[PDB]
Design a protein around this ligand. Structure first.
Ligand SMILES: Nc1nc2c(ncn2[C@@H]2O[C@H](COP(=O)(O)OP(=O)(O)OP(=O)(O)O)[C@@H](O)[C@H]2O)c(=O)[nH]1
Ligand SMILES: Nc1nc2c(ncn2[C@@H]2O[C@H](COP(=O)(O)OP(=O)(O)OP(=O)(O)O)[C@@H](O)[C@H]2O)c(=O)[nH]1
Ligand SMILES: Nc1nc2c(ncn2[C@@H]2O[C@H](COP(=O)(O)OP(=O)(O)OP(=O)(O)O)[C@@H](O)[C@H]2O)c(=O)[nH]1
Lengths: 438, 427, 62, 200, 438
């Protein structure tokens, strides 16, 4: 039936996964123990959780996600949290040694004797599943353990299983903030390996997430709890089609088919419109028109790109809550009459609408608004090239003076792979303008 | 006796048939449990045209539901009348379409066509003699077009002596949501023109306008839109089920309706659409019925035939009228705009009067038209296809499914021939 | 709300009146006392056999 | 399973809850299957010698009926039912609703029952079940002795009538009395309304 | 009716012994004294115990087994244990002297004057028995006392009574662990002597038992308490067909007829699939599909043999608990469709199924999980010859230099008996390869 498996690689990609499942357990009323109240919803694992959790005859919801990590501290800490009894123990795949931010160390040195283990996990997850539309891979481009470890495993799950979807989600590196100067090294290493096997790679950047916080959510001082909850809401919105229904229902197969124009480029941009404070939502009102304008207001995007510097190809709005076809279709019709929004002439239409009756709920101890009509805006535009354009000139300078290569040639690589990725990136940029040129 | 078996295809038809069937049950007065409440002998007399009977007085509908997505029919089954629908005829697949035409035409159909054919022949042997078949689907629907094109092709050689009624809704001209949408329609219409005998054309934009024009209710449900189209499709069916002097056979109609073989596209027409006060502010008279009947605003199908002219017109009247008011109105409409007809055919109107009104209103009518207003339609779909076939956007999927650009060439070429034909016969 | 409570929390207070049962889950790292010295019970039970006696003899646990 | 197919278009595998099976389970030396002991009823009694070991499985409600073989007779028996959860002897054959099965609200001391056919009579029990009976009286208000105190404290007129007759049975004031007289002298004062269970 | 006698040879085979009835008395609820409460299950000895115990008019459950031993220490301490009052005193056949790990010392020096005494027990227990389907022989190949004494009694019980089954159970020698370097001497002595008389010999190895403990049972440091309880369950599962019933019942006679293909080789492999910790079973689920994959998982077997290095002839699954044929017959159908599993082409069918409604139970103060559906996997594959292949090169070198022969030739042997064994073994591998040839 309608189910998928979530994968969280990298200790930065694990805390995001926990919050999502903490959010996920909310709308289903999951008690931390693992069971419902005396209300009868348990069975052979067949109810709203069947797409998400495995509350089988034993009565305990088993999340259908695997947590993989290479440093035991944080994964032990969450294993000492509140919902650890929900979690399957050795789905929390831990590690005793780190990759030291090295892509290849997380790809060659230790991955060989760990991939076989997680290979056993996925197959014994694969057999119990029925439809298993695809996977939910949470990672990071500049992963201290996220980058290299994900790379090889995504290769192996591609070669055995090339018939289903693979959904990729990584924090995009901050264009001007770099916690490590080796971050470009592994990041382009990820991209060139992932271009020929990844299905749908979705990115996000924290600075504009921070920028949102103190703009409209009015958060001068945020925490990951805020970040994790809001991104956890994002995946909740896109997965609401699986949980609930609506006037029409859409699936990841449609998202793949209708968003990506041509092979290689599969990197659209998400955005959630009703990101407002409770008090602001209190004495103000929400309707489709303003959220349609707000979702297309350039400063509301979390990627530092000006849409007027590029051109639009695909769009996707997922209206969750109490909406009618009437106002939406007229509103987007006005958007088509807009002159600023420069779609490419190739597509007369480039939007996919998802209508869901269920309104997004609040979380206890939360900071979001009380939304009745919500929408997640997934779009792809030519205004994304400057990102890798920023990356390449950062790389070429450092590569020319070949900084810290002694670290990498020290443990077993050569320059050829680092060479290949550059023209691969050069291939990507030229494709972007070639399709950018009408 | 002569009966009809219905086909419910595509996820749009999933709302259609359910709304289509419930009106009929309410029209005939069957309760949601299925136990009819016998009040009108004639509706008891003419229920065998569509429904078979089970034990305990529960009229089993002779319809088949087909889909791939379980969630849609679960809502349908959990609907007020799902119990009136059989677990038998609920046929489906274990696959997601991706809203893809090729998958539903070559990949997923293969393992399901066997089951659906085995189904329909079972109820085909259940009944005596069919007039034909009718299909509720969409030309732009990923599953409806994919299933329909396969099925109608197979049915053609199976029973080449019956009626292949096709009820398909055209997507919004301005907006299509689906971006491969022009591909899917062009693919389907290539086979549709070959296989069908009749086609209804429906669009939501006019339905949206009709909400603004006469419904006047700002925010309606899409189901009420189905209520409208179900009312339209029911009117043509009222002819068969009801006595009163009007000739009901669609073949009685189609031969008067179809001058040349490739004319399958026809437009609906309906009678009083009434608003807030007009219910108590209307003098319900055949003149004003005829007035509102022939209104470009009362038009709902595709676009205004004002851009073109009229080939064949046929209106069915339901209620207690007489031969003279229909006669004089036809004279009235003939004189008002004589040149707007085509000189090819004079007196091109076909009138049928049903003496059995609906339950709720007395004076009512339906109209079916074949005008020179479809040029803009396939002319419209021409430009997108040419521009999107110009640079073969969104093509790696279908080639991955096994199709090639060549099939596109004749599909548009056939449509181009239709452009000339619709142009040449009028201009 | 909390930071303003600090005013009532400090100002006139500062002024003075001028006076689990089922242990834990396996492959857990991080040394709590005892463990490996005692043995022969499952990691779940080893934690919960301890959990009751970690309150008894290795009581230096607070 | 008829109702499993009566769920939706797709089937579902219902089962028995492990919960009730967990607590209600003979674990270790502790047992849970009650064992009562009674006779059969016919026109004339021939083999009422076999004290029927009716074994109500508290986890499965599956009354096993076992037989101890008696010296020099035609019994040659033992088990009568293979631990089968048995249908209520008050049901129909054309069924339209969920039919019922024998619960635990009838096996009072000195009972008359039917296991699908032969009418069976209960006389006594074992201590362990009665120990269980006295523990949880929620489903066993018969085991509630204080309840029986109210029924017999209702009657006040027979006070002297009580005093003399049960005085009459005694003759030496020995401060004991046999059960056989004691049970009999009680059945009248309740006018045949006392059930054996509370008398025990 | 349905009964068998059990013989426990060697102080290795004794602690595994008492663990059996410590288990056995449990599901029967037997008090350590030897009597039930005032409830009635006693009589002429005819109830659930009649197949195992002898609870006559005295009312004391007398186990139908014999404990033979040569060192008074361990047999006396159990005679001072908890259930010693249950045990018949002189069926604890004790001894005052050891065989010193020597097969022949126990086979010639002392066995002659002890075998008569045990035979007196054997015939006297045989007379009281009525059905007496077969024997239970718990012994050990590397028997300090198990080796020699078991062989001679097996020889004597074979000649007088060769019309019934004999079930042998000995710990298989560890592939790499050697508690004694004289073990190869007596081990092949046992093998060559037993091939022409033994009906069904079943082996096991403790290292893999150890490996399971810290994989899923979460036992990083076990004791025989755990070890004996695991194997004690194994014989309990196979004997449940006699104790209880199910959809169908099977007997040891079917085990003999259907498992062994040809004479000589009668050495299948046993396995139990739902080996799991309690909490794992607590918040996970058991069903036929996953346990069927697990039971054919190569690391689930207690013998260091890779099934992909050999080919299968026979298999047996014993479903103890709540199962239905539908998901059973479907799942096993999927198993035969699998390509990695390589049965020999001669047998289209090589499996024997046992269905028992009774769910397996836990032991108080125990280590197993609370199991509803269980299965014992008695299977035979050609991949076992490696162990004998391992033994011969171990044996040939040490025989080439004749280590410690003066111990054996000192107390009354020569080389011909050793000499006959190597070609009998060499026959075994060549037989194994000929049956390995199609
Ligand atoms: N996705 C995510 N990223 C974070 C979070 N907090 C910080 N980051 C950034 O994401 C990057 C994660 O990459 P890595 O640091 O290599 O993570 P890793 O590969 O699992 O191994 P470590 O270096 O030990 O964390 C960090 O460099 C941070 O800059 C977070 O909560 N979630
Ligand atoms: N049932 C239903 N269909 C709608 C509605 N609004 C628009 N539609 C359209 O009706 C079309 C026909 O439905 P189907 O043929 O069953 O669609 P499909 O083959 O499953 O694939 P898609 O066309 O992508 O949905 C769909 O493409 C929808 O775009 C609605 O409110 N209800
Ligand atoms: N069956 C069994 N074997 C054990 C146990 N503990 C250790 N072992 C192994 O089993 C073997 C025991 O064989 P032997 O030492 O010859 O036993 P024995 O012939 O009865 O006499 P002893 O040498 O005194 O023990 C040893 O090699 C151990 O590796 C146990 O509890 N049961």
């Amino acid at each position: 039936m309608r189910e998928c498996i979530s994968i969280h690689v990298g200790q930065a990609g694990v805390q995001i996964g926990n919050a999502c499942w903490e959010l996920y357990c909310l709308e289903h009323g999951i008690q931390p123990d693992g069971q419902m109240p005396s209300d009868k919803t348990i069975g052979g694992g067949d109810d709203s959780f069947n797409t998400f959790f495995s509350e089988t005859g034993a009565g305990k919801h088993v999340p259908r996600a695997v947590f993989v990590d290479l440093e035991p501290t944080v994964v032990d800490e969450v294993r000492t949290g509140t919902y650890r009894q929900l979690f399957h123990p050795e789905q929390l795949i831990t590690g005793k040694e780190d990759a030291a931010n090295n892509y290849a160390r997380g790809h060659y040195t230790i991955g060989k004797e760990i991939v076989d283990l997680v290979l056993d996990r996925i197959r014994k997850l694969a057999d119990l599943c029925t439809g298993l539309q695809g996977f939910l891979i949470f990672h990071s481009f500049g992963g201290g353990t996220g980058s290299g470890f994900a790379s090889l495993l995504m290769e192996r799950l591609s070669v055995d299983y090339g018939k289903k979807s693979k959904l990729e989600f990584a924090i995009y590196p901050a264009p001007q903030v770099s916690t490590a100067v080796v971050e470009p090294y592994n990041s382009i290493l990820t991209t060139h390996t992932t271009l020929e096997h990844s299905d749908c790679a979705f990115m996000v950047d924290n600075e504009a997430i921070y920028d949102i916080c103190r703009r409209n959510l009015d958060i001068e001082r945020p925490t990951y709890t805020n970040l994790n909850r809001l991104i956890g809401q994002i995946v909740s919105s896109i997965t609401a089609s699986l949980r609930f229904d609506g006037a029409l229902n859409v699936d990841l197969t449609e998202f793949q088919t209708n968003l990506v124009p041509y092979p290689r480029i599969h990197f659209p941009l998400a955005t959630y419109a009703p990101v407002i404070s409770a008090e602001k939502a209190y004495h103000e009102q929400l309707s489709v028109a303003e959220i349609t304008n707000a979702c297309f207001e350039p400063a509301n995007q979390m990627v530092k790109c000006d849409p007027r510097h590029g051109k639009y190809m695909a769009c996707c709005m997922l209206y969750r809550g109490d909406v009618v076809p009437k106002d939406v279709n007229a509103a987007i019709a006005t958007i088509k009459t807009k002159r600023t929004i420069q779609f490419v002439d190739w597509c007369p239409t480039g939007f996919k609408v998802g209508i869901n009756y269920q309104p997004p709920t609040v979380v206890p101890g939360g900071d979001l608004a009380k939304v009745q009509r919500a929408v997640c805006m997934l779009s792809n535009t030519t205004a994304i090239a400057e990102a890798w354009a920023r990356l390449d000139h950062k790389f070429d300078l450092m590569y020319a003076k070949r900084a810290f290569v002694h670290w990498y040639v020290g443990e077993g690589m050569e320059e050829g792979e680092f060479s290949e990725a550059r023209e691969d990136l050069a291939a990507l940029e030229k494709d972007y303008e070639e399709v950018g040129v009408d | 006796m002569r009966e009809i078996v219905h086909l419910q295809a595509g996820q749009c038809g999933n709302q259609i048939g359910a709304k289509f069937w419930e009106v009929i049950s309410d029209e005939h007065g069957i309760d949601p449990t299925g136990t009819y409440h016998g009040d009108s002998d004639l509706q008891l007399e003419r229920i065998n045209v569509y429904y078979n009977e089970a034990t305990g007085g529960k009229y089993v509908p002779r319809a088949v539901l087909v889909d791939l997505e379980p969630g849609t029919m679960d809502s349908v089954r959990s609907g007020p009348f799902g119990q009136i629908f059989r677990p038998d005829n609920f046929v489906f697949g274990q696959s997601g379409a991706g809203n893809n035409w090729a998958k539903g035409h070559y990949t997923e159909g293969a393992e399901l066509v066997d089951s659906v054919l085995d189904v329909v022949r079972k109820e085909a042997e259940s009944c005596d003699c069919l007039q034909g078949f009718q299909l509720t689907h969409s030309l732009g629907g990923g599953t409806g077009s994919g299933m329909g094109t396969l099925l109608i092709s197979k049915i053609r050689e199976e029973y080449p002596d019956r009626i292949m009624n096709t009820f398909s809704v055209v997507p919004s001209p301005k907006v299509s949501d689906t971006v491969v949408e022009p591909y899917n329609a062009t693919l389907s219409v290539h086979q549709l023109v070959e296989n069908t005998d009749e086609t209804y054309c429906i669009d939501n934009e006019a339905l949206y306008d009709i909400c603004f024009r006469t419904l006047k209710l700002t925010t309606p449900t899409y189901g009420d839109l189905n209520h409208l189209v179900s009312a339209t499709m029911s009117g043509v069916t009222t002819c068969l089920r009801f006595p009163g002097q009007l000739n009901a056979d669609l073949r009685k109609l189609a031969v008067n309706m179809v001058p040349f073989p490739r004319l399958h596209f026809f437009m609906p027409g309906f009678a009083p659409l009434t608003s807030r006060g007009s219910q108590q502010y209307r003098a319900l008279t055949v003149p004003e019925l005829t007035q509102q009947m022939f209104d470009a605003k009362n038009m709902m199908a595709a676009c205004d035939p004002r851009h073109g002219r009229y080939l064949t017109v046929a209106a069915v009247f339901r209620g207690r009228m007489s031969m003279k008011e229909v006669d004089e109105q036809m004279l009235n409409v003939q004189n008002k705009n004589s040149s707007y007809f085509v000189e090819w055919i004079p007196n091109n109107v076909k009138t049928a009067v049903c003496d059995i009104p609906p339950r709720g209103l007395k004076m009512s009518a339906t109209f079916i038209g074949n005008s020179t207003a479809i040029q803009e339609l396939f002319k419209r779909i021409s430009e997108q296809f040419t521009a999107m076939f110009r640079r073969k956007a969104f093509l790696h999927w279908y080639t991955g499914e096994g199709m090639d650009e060549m099939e596109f060439t004749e599909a548009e070429s056939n449509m181009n021939d239709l452009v000339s034909e619709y142009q040449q016969y009028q201009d | 709300t909390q930071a303003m409570d600090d005013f009532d929390k400090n100002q006139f207070v500062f002024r003075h009146p001028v006076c689990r049962s089922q242990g834990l889950i396996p492959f857990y790292m991080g040394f709590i006392p005892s463990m490996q010295d005692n043995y022969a019970l499952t990691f779940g039970n080893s934690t919960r056999r301890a959990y009751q006696k970690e309150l008894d003899r290795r009581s230096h646990t607070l | 399973d008829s109702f499993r197919s009566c769920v939706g278009l797709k089937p579902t595998p219902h089962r028995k809850n492990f919960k009730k099976f967990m607590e209600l389970d003979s674990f270790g030396n502790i047992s849970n299957i009650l064992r009562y002991f009674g006779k059969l009823i016919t026109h004339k009694c021939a083999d009422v010698d076999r004290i029927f070991v009716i074994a109500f499985y508290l986890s499965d409600d599956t009354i096993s009926v076992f037989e101890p073989i008696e010296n020099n007779s035609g019994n040659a028996g033992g088990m009568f039912l293979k631990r089968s959860r048995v249908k209520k002897p008050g049901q129909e054959v054309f069924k339209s609703e969920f039919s019922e099965y024998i619960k635990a609200e009838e096996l009072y001391i000195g009972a008359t029952v039917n296991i699908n056919g032969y009418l069976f009579i209960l006389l006594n029990a074992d201590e362990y079940t009665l120990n269980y009976m006295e523990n949880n009286t929620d489903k066993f208000p018969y085991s509630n002795f204080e309840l029986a105190i109210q029924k017999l404290k209702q009657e006040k007129s027979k006070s002297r009538e009580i005093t003399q007759v049960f005085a009459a049975a005694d003759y030496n004031h020995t401060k004991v009395v046999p059960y056989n007289t004691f049970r009999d002298i009680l059945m009248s004062i309740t006018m045949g309304k006392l059930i054996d269970q509370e008398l025990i």
